Design a protein around this ligand. Sequence first.
Ligand SMILES: *[C@@H]1O[C@H](CO)[C@@H](O[C@@H]2O[C@H](CO)[C@@H](O)[C@H](O)[C@H]2NC(C)=O)[C@H](O)[C@H]1NC(C)=O
Ligand SMILES: *[C@@H]1O[C@H](CO)[C@@H](O[C@@H]2O[C@H](CO)[C@@H](O)[C@H](O)[C@H]2NC(C)=O)[C@H](O)[C@H]1NC(C)=O
Ligand SMILES: *[C@@H]1O[C@H](CO)[C@@H](O)[C@H](O)[C@H]1NC(C)=O
Lengths: 141, 516
Amino acid sequence: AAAVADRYAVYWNSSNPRFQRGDYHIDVCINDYLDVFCPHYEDSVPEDKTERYVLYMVNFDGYSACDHTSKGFKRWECNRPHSPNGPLKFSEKFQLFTPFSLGFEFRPGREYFYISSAIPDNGRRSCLKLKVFVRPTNSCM
Amino acid sequence: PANEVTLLDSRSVQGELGWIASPLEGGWEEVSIMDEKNTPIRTYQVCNVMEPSQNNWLRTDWITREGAQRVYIEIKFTLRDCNSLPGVMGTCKETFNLYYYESDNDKERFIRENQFVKIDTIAADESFTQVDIGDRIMKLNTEIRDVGPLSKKGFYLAFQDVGACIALVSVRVFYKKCPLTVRNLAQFPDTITGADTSSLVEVRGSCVNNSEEKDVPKMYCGADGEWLVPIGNCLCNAGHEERSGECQACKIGYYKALSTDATCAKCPPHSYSVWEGATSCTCDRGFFRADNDAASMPCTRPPSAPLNLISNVNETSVNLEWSSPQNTGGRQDISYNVVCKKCGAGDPSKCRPCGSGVHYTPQQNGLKTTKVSITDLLAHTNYTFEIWAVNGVSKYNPNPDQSVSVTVTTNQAAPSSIALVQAKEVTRYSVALAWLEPDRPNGVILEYEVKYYEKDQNERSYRIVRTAARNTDIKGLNPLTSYVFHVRARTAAGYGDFSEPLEVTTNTVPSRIIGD
Ligand SMILES: *[C@@H]1O[C@H](CO)[C@@H](O[C@@H]2O[C@H](CO)[C@@H](O)[C@H](O)[C@H]2NC(C)=O)[C@H](O)[C@H]1NC(C)=O
Ligand SMILES: *[C@@H]1O[C@H](CO)[C@@H](O[C@@H]2O[C@H](CO)[C@@H](O)[C@H](O)[C@H]2NC(C)=O)[C@H](O)[C@H]1NC(C)=O
Ligand SMILES: *[C@@H]1O[C@H](CO)[C@@H](O)[C@H](O)[C@H]1NC(C)=O
């Protein structure tokens, strides 16, 4: 395939080591994509023998404490573990300007944060989380 | 709504919507977003407002048209102001192009480069700005366009971006139909609209279970999915009424006689319907309806006996008068019949019918008033009368207590003549007479009167003798002399006619009273 732009892929389950010390982070350039994949299972699996969560984009202070409340914005629902064709996919473009009114904007050299709450609803002091650093233009071009 | 049928819904394509973008990268891009409904959804967006020339295509899957000919497209989107995009001088646009093409090939893999046909240029009514992002105002546009008449199994839709900054929130594609409905007790099927937005489709209806067609049921289907002004109707069969859009059977205790009747009514007085769907009511026990009839009209009964039977009598004539019964049943067709009889010590009802050439004025039968005058009958017999209270029924239940009887004893008049007077013994000075009772006494005979005189007009003396017995001895007469005798009878009404003259001449036979 063609590209100018890169896509970072991220599998969000708790099986995923990159999450372990709660320090998963990526460096992206502007107009790159991040693709978070949801946990997705075999048809023959009970929907409660199953990991599901809600993804939230939150500031530093709520990156620290695993807390979305009054911190950021709901972004995705990973609740559909038997998703018809592949896992449920959240795409994020790290663009300067949104064509969507209630979309999201990103500046170079700034840094951005994602966390999640489960559908098991447990109040966690512990959550799977992601820091994204959007590089300076002079590491990109 | 109930009149729109979806052929495509981007939000509803839960199995992920697979559309061809050309270019596959750097043009329309699918990107995750929270909608007006707060659902997380994939949508396409493009924002390449800084390049000199842009040509970005996004094309849907093949969309089967079903049977529709006029298809609507409703696009929800957001478009950003070129003012709010910094330093975009020359190239930024605020519109996008909308295309379709028809095809029976559902697996055309590659966006056609020629064959697409422009539906419209779509502009926004609420272009958005930095502030809206700031405050989380989602200025969401809706535009609808429509295409057709469509002829192939399916079509594709496309969107071309030439330099706007835009986000397609939803695409929904549909056609319109007039929904299944019942009008004037005819059923009309789901009907797809016609080829143009001004097309009417004529639809013939089917009479609902269970009803009959009056005028052929028809209705027109409007382009906007509203049924237009109908013509024709069906009527609910007898025993059924219209409720909702059905002909339901009449409730217990209710009936409907003809289809041309409005609704069910309840059974009128003294009739009942024990079954649902009743076209008639079965009259109650002892009740009936005349040949001149309406099943609407209540059932009635034979009346009671007429009242205050009041008799007047003249010598050989009875005048009668009575009053309306206690219970008429009831109806205005009450009449009376008079019945004559003859009895006496025969209390047992041993009464020959008297049938004769009597009247009976004015009628004797089917009588409307409460009076009747009987004439031309025999003097000293006990007649019996029955007066019968009748109506339009009672031919269906007759009975002697619908009548009251007067046994009446007639008046008396002066008797007939005797006809037979005989001389039993003749002496020189006496005539012994004997006679029979007159044929018609016409009453109680009180006495008899004998009138006699000499046959010769010269020296003639008229003499009279009275008696209770049917015989007498006229004494003291001239011997060898011819006499004439007449006899008459008397009742309280007067004298009968004198008998035919009896001529008797005294002889010379010695009187034994005289002796020696
Ligand atoms: C859990 O996440 C793991 C990785 O952390 C997923 O594993 C990847 O699955 C993809 C897509 O099928 C493969 O292409 C990768 O190579 C896999 N990596 C590994 C290490 O196996 C895994 O599928 C996720 N699964 C569920 C069910 O949540
Ligand atoms: C008409 O009717 C009566 C019977 O109802 C006849 O005789 C009557 O008999 C009763 C005694 O049982 C007496 O009072 C009288 O002798 C009669 N009744 C009346 C009211 O006078 C009677 O003879 C009949 N008349 C004729 C002409 O046949
Ligand atoms: C008896 O009455 C009838 C009818 O009213 C009448 O014609 C008849 O002359 C009457 N006889 C009399 C009054 O003696």
